[PDB]
Design a protein around this ligand. Sequence first.
Ligand SMILES: [Cs+]
Ligand SMILES: [Cs+]
Ligand SMILES: [Cs+]
Length: 138
Amino acid sequence: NITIYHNPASGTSRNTLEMIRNSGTEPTIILYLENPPSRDELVKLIADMGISVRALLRKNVEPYEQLGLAEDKFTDDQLIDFMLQHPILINRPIVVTPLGTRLCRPSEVVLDILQDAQKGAFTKEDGEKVVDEAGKRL
Ligand SMILES: [Cs+]
Ligand SMILES: [Cs+]
Ligand SMILES: [Cs+]
């Protein structure tokens, strides 16, 4: 039982989603830009991911620029509420499995929380080899 907060327009997210599938599981896909987590859910995700709230913020997007978020003048709860109101600020993808939750940047971080091994070699969209046929990480 796996959930991915996915952005089809993200190469990292597309690579992550294909690695999930290559472990033999079809995840529940949440298109977070349109169906963001609730506050409670986002707070839990952040806790489980082991990163700071700021580390989840995606840079180079309109609200990051216009709200001035690069500046260190925001508490964690201020940043969480911005993410909820502007979901493009939530970096991607976040994956939840029975083993744990991770921000899968780079995509192969997802290998930590997938329960079943990749079923064969995996190469990212751009040609970067991730696991070989034998299952060894490169
Ligand atoms: Cs929701
Ligand atoms: Cs806009
Ligand atoms: Cs694992």
